[PDB]
Structure 1
Amino acid sequence: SMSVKKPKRDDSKDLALCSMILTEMETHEDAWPFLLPVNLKLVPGYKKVIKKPMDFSTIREKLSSGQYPNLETFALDVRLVFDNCETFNEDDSDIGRAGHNMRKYFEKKWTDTFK
């Protein structure tokens, strides 16, 4: 409360560490469905159904331009990529399976880096 603060968790490395995690996600062999924004002209249904599209290239640009206020807003966008994927793709499809694999990979790196 006013003039009463918990001890300051060091966040000065968070930008660098999120950049490293994002590089590892970008270079995973199953990243291909997620590298670029879904083409809203060419993929019927996507525009209407997926209210907030997100992809790795868009996260990379937001990261590089100071558009994440803290490390939690960065994790929210990464999770959005996988939540969108599960909304639009069957579990038993190459893309559906890619999404599950990537979400697993991310969540381990997140825990190991920050928790």
Structure 2
Amino acid sequence: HMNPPPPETSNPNKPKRQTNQLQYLLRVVLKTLWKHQFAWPFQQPVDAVKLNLPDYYKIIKTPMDMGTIKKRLENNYYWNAQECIQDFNTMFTNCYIYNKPGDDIVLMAEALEKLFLQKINELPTEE
């Protein structure tokens, strides 16, 4: 079994705009989650080959990780903040679907999600 290529993070055909919400998602949300004590497994795609998980990419068809989110924000890949919020939600839901409730990785994802939800509640109004 092989890992798939990582998610796309740049498309120069996609229109680009800088908004206070997108700036907040990179400088505040992504930065805060990146620095969390439990963030390291979420900083790059699930390495199914290294971890010998041949079923991971049979179950998870929409993989997502924070390394991908960081690059999509830097590349102005998202036109609206909701597309970015969806990617974080996909990353958390993937972890919950693949792993058993109560497993260490799930507890780590739940701690990151609690922090994420706190920062999203503080999402600034569109300027």
Q: Same fold (TM over 0.5)?
A: yes
Which letter does structure 1 place at the counterpart of 2:41?
P
> What is aligned with 1:30?
38
Structure 1: unaligned runs, 5 residues or longer:
1-10
Q: Pick 1 or 2: higher relative contact order, CA cutoff 8 A, min separation 6.
A: 2
TM-superposed deviation, 1:101: 1.1
What does the per-residue CA deviation read over 1:61-80, in whole Å, with 9 as the maximum and x for residues that have no partner? 11111111100001000010
> What is aligned with 1:79?
89
What does the per-residue CA deviation read over 1:87-111, in whole Å, with 9 as the maximum and x for residues that have no partner? 1111211101011111111011101
Structure 2: how far apart are the matches of 1:70 and 1:48? 30
Aligned-residue sequence identity (percent) comes to: 30
> What is aligned with 2:118?
108
Which letter does structure 2 place at the counterpart of 1:12?
T
Task: Indicate the structure (1 or 2) with the bigger Cα radius of gyration.
Answer: 1
Structure 2: how far apart are the matches of 1:102 and 1:29? 9
Structure 2: how far apart are the matches of 1:40 and 1:22? 24
Structure 2: unaligned runs, 5 residues or longer:
1-17
